[PDB]
Design a protein around this ligand. Sequence first.
Ligand SMILES: OC[C@H]1O[C@@H]2O[C@H]3[C@H](O)[C@@H](O)[C@@H](O[C@H]4[C@H](O)[C@@H](O)[C@@H](O[C@H]5[C@H](O)[C@@H](O)[C@@H](O[C@H]6[C@H](O)[C@@H](O)[C@@H](O[C@H]7[C@H](O)[C@@H](O)[C@@H](O[C@H]1[C@H](O)[C@H]2O)O[C@@H]7CO)O[C@@H]6CO)O[C@@H]5CO)O[C@@H]4CO)O[C@@H]3CO
Length: 486
Amino acid sequence: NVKGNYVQVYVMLPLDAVSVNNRFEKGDELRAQLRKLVEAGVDGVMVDVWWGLVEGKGPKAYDWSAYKQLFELVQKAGLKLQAIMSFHQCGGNVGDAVNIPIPQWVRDVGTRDPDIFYTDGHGTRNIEYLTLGVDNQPLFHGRSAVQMYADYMTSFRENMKEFLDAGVIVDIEVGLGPAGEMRYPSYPQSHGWSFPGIGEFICYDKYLQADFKAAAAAVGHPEWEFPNDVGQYNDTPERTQFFRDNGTYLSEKGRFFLAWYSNNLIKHGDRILDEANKVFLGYKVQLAIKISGIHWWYKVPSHAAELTAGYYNLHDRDGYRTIARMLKRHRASINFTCAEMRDSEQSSQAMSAPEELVQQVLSAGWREGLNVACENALPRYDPTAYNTILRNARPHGINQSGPPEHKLFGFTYLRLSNQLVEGQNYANFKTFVDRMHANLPRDPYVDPMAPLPRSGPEISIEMILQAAQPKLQPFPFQEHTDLPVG
Ligand SMILES: OC[C@H]1O[C@@H]2O[C@H]3[C@H](O)[C@@H](O)[C@@H](O[C@H]4[C@H](O)[C@@H](O)[C@@H](O[C@H]5[C@H](O)[C@@H](O)[C@@H](O[C@H]6[C@H](O)[C@@H](O)[C@@H](O[C@H]7[C@H](O)[C@@H](O)[C@@H](O[C@H]1[C@H](O)[C@H]2O)O[C@@H]7CO)O[C@@H]6CO)O[C@@H]5CO)O[C@@H]4CO)O[C@@H]3CO
């Protein structure tokens, strides 16, 4: 009996599932594409629920019309639905077809208060997301950012209650930064970063500067400032005194700054997840966050790109198990990425280790008792990619008589297009789904969810950080799947 091996497969809908005008205008095309997903046995779909579309008119002027039409179509296709609370800009980089900023009335606050945006050491403002520094600042016609997020989720729950009750909506992913990821905008691809630069620390907004000053004063070092020996976006670690091997990242001051920077992300996630848990209390849904996959520089001592993204991960410090520990009280899950990548596929100069990073994050989630799901980082249509995903989905292979010791709770494929569902691409994709399902038919009843309980007691940052050390080896992963596409 191999049923416990089944891993659900979701497919991300196009970024334009709802138009930039907040109208649902590609229903017939989508219905035809969803037929192909149903033919393939897919468990459900995933979609961005864009803040800039829904609350674009003004405060609390939510327009759910288009999303309700979309969700009805998905329900009528017999598919489940994962909804992202997308509190960030869609697109805005060079060549992006779909461009949806956060609400204009929110950005208008930035004219008199530009420090509502994450800001770099140059003073450049990133307009894709509101700094965590304004989470509890009542700057937005009397509301704080967290209040806006909570109110949006409340309105979503009220409007989408029938889809929740019917078992259509099964997961809520809470966007926590740029691209919906719990990170800083440290790698701004259209404004001065190119892969594989180290990135930069994006903590110069006046709110975060004041918070650092207070933190530094509480430990008797009022004079401390952010590190200045950090180079710039497109540097490599040895270009800098901070990130080089044996560099200043190791110093007392460096450790304090890195802990402060990464802790703020953890605290941001904790406070917003608490609000999300209160909103969805009693509904049969999983809450999730999305951790960015920063695989470049993983092989060097400083892990520089992870550090600037906000993940304080080193050889001897588990910067993902701390995040996982924070999620535990909420019974929140991790949605990770890079599930399709092999190390051999990456350029040498990027010092990139996606396989090891995936193993680290999955192992950290499992050690904290969490569900862990994953996505592919880049578009792939080939058997090798599918077989890499399969390995990561069941690291120990198939258990012949029960559940395996570890497995992904789900996989979400990025992303649906016409190209996916024709030709050889489609044949490869359908076989993948079969393999993820352990060669069983689709099970509409799989992975039932209990009504969501209230978050457990708030734990301090010090309690969360007990998870950082000692750093443990990952659980063993097979080199290759035992159930390949063929
Ligand atoms: O809309 C842009 C992009 O958004 C999303 O991508 C994320 C991605 O999930 C993150 O992992 C990160 O990407 C990193 C990579 O992880 C990192 O390896 C590196 O990427 C390099 C690739 O490794 C290398 O193959 C090559 O990429 C090619 C690739 O062969 C092509 O597929 C093509 O990419 C286009 C995609 O087809 C298209 O979907 C879209 O990309 C989305 C992506 O789907 C989504 O998941 O547009 C791109 C065109 O840029 O061409 C590229 C050549 O550029 O080279 C890159 C080196 O740049 O670095 C990236 C970050 O640059 O971040 C992205 C962005 O949020």
